[PDB]
């Protein structure tokens, strides 16, 4: 067959898109307790009853959480059981034998979800599939209770019967392709822009100022983001696994919290710096010797190091629940789990304290402007646009992540994992935007003009 190409059309890839890999017991659309990939633990309303059924199926005390290895085996046990039920049942097998392999998955998909006896209930609909009345059965199936409870999944199945193609499922794969090239472009902009900013200030003596020294610390944190944090995050998400061992992912996690904390705090430092330099240019200039601007950045990185490496390498961030323990003991799993104390403590230091200081700073900059020795002119509006981009971009990139992060602490299961990852990557791209915001100055544009060889 020689088909090792991506999205082979088959039942296994069909159901995984529909059900999804969840390693903890969860309640499905109907309300029943489900684990793994659509594995129905029990029809009982007691989580305790579902656990013992799970423990009987697995053979150990799962505590409600199974490994990815075990979840795969239940799925295959569930798929083959659905295949056996079709071959055993007298209504399904005549329909099943007369179906091409693509529409066989759609029938097995139904039997997977609703069972042998439940799917055999479609007296007219199954009879239409024998007679190859696809569109006519498609309209028939859309009227079922199965359609009302899960309209989205039924559409994919009903369309799959109707066309005999994987059009309902093949489109999902473009997402992984488009996500990869988007994740790719993000790495380029962060590495290119930040190296370009670092190189300009270091090579050109005109740019070696105090405010730019703060820019340099910002550019270094954003650089390591694009070099270290972001590339492995793309590799982690696309391949669905971690391939570098436990130690390196805590060390990767350690760099992630390190750079983001240092980057955001430096934005806060730059904000206050410009407040002082704009509202008291002369007193401020007396203050900052080269040693202070050096010790300030030192504090930012010491504070950032204490938030990132010290809790993570000392296992203080470690969560205590069973699903965290397994991912901690699994070499290939590096999902992010933390106790409530670290999540709150890190969020305040990394984001909330800088946010409050930043918001207050630019407010007073805009507040100081009106009480000066002086009629709705342009540059006052033009200046207000500039800070709106600065604070607006910072806010819109990171405020969803750390709100959702804190919301995840207060109430569990409210944040699905995809939203949590998406917003972090929307936070990741602030590193690419920071050179575009803070390096608009005339001396930068000249330095970039010569660094790019005109």
């Amino acid at each position, epitope marked *: 067959d020689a088909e090792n190409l991506y999205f082979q059309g088959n039942i296994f890839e069909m159901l995984r898109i529909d059900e999804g890999l969840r390693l903890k017991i969860y309640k499905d659309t109907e309300g029943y307790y489900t684990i793994g990939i659509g594995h129905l633990l029990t029809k009982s309303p007691s989580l305790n009853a579902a656990k013992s059924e799970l423990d009987k199926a697995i053979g150990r005390n799962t505590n409600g959480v199974i490994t990815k290895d075990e979840a795969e085996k239940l799925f295959n046990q569930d798929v083959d059981a659905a295949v056996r039920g079709i071959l055993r049942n007298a209504k399904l097998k005549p329909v099943y034998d007369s179906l091409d392999a693509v529409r066989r998955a759609a029938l097995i998909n139904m039997v997977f979800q609703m069972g042998e006896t439940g799917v055999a209930g479609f007296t007219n609909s199954l009879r239409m599939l024998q007679q190859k009345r696809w569109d006519e059965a498609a309209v028939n199936l859309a009227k079922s209770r199965w359609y009302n409870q899960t309209p989205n999944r039924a559409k994919r199945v009903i369309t799959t019967f109707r066309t005999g193609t994987w059009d309902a499922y093949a489109a999902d794969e473009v997402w992984v392709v488009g996500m990869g090239i988007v994740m790719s472009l993000i790495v380029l902009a962060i590495v290119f822009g930040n190296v370009l900013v670092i190189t300009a200030i270091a090579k050109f003596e005109r740019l070696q100022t105090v405010t730019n020294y703060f820019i340099t610390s910002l550019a270094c944190a954003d650089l390591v983001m694009g070099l270290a944090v972001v590339p492995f995050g793309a590799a982690h998400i696309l391949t669905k696994t971690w391939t570098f061992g436990n130690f390196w992912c805590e060390f990767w996690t350690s760099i992630d919290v390190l750079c983001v904390t240092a980057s955001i705090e430096t934005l806060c430092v730059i904000a206050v710096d410009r407040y002082f330099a704009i509202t008291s240019p002369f007193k401020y200039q007396s203050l900052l010797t080269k040693n202070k601007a050096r010790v300030i950045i030192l504090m930012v990185w010491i504070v950032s190091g204490l938030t990132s490496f010290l809790p993570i390498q000392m296992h203080w961030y470690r969560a205590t629940h069973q699903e965290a323990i397994n991912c901690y003991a699994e070499e290939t799993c590096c999902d992010f789990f933390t106790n409530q104390a670290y999540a709150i403590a890190s969020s305040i230091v990394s984001f909330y304290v800088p946010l409050v200081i930043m918001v207050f700073v630019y407010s007073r900059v805009f507040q100081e*402007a009106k009480r000066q020795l*002086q009629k709705f002119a*342009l*540059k*006052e509006h033009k200046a207000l646009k500039t800070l709106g981009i600065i604070m607006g971009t910072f806010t819109l990139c990171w405020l969803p992540f750390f709100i959702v992060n804190i919301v995840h602490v207060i109430q569990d299961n409210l944040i699905r994992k995809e939203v949590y990852i998406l917003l972090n990557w929307i936070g990741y791209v602030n590193s690419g935007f920071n050179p575009l915001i803070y390096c608009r*100055s*005339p*001396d930068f544009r000249i330095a970039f003009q010569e660094l790019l060889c005109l």
Partner: nanobody, 120 residues
């Protein structure tokens, strides 16, 4: 789109007094610095006297106690009062405007230029 109009360039004897006046046109952000820079022959441009929009000033050490900077109350006009002029004070005084409209970087405006001559 902004203008700087420099006035008061003078020939004067040593110890005499000069007054330099700068006026600005267009639209300038409220948070700004207007100052005076001089460049001596074969020397680098240096700060002489500066005033912030809020009234805070700054003077070079060589001109402290001798030069006084003042500002118009509402017309973006700056006056440099130079007294006890020394022959070392012989340079060309440039009207400056430091502009904070773009928050991250200060953006300068420069004046035309006026000659000050002190005769020993």
């Amino acid at each position: 789109q902004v203008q700087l109009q420099e006035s008061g360039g003078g020939l004067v004897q040593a110890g005499g007094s000069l007054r330099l006046s700068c006026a600005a046109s267009g639209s300038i952000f409220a948070l700004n610095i207007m100052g005076w820079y001089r460049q001596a022959p074969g020397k680098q441009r240096e700060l002489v006297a500066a005033i912030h929009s809020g009234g805070t000033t700054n003077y070079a050490n060589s001109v402290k106690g001798r030069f006084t900077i003042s500002r118009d109350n509402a017309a973006n006009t700056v006056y440099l009062q130079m007294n006890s002029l020394k022959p070392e004070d012989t340079a060309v005084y440039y009207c400056n405007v430091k502009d904070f409209g773009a928050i991250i970087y200060d953006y300068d405006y420069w004046g035309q230029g006026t000659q000050v001559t002190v005769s020993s």
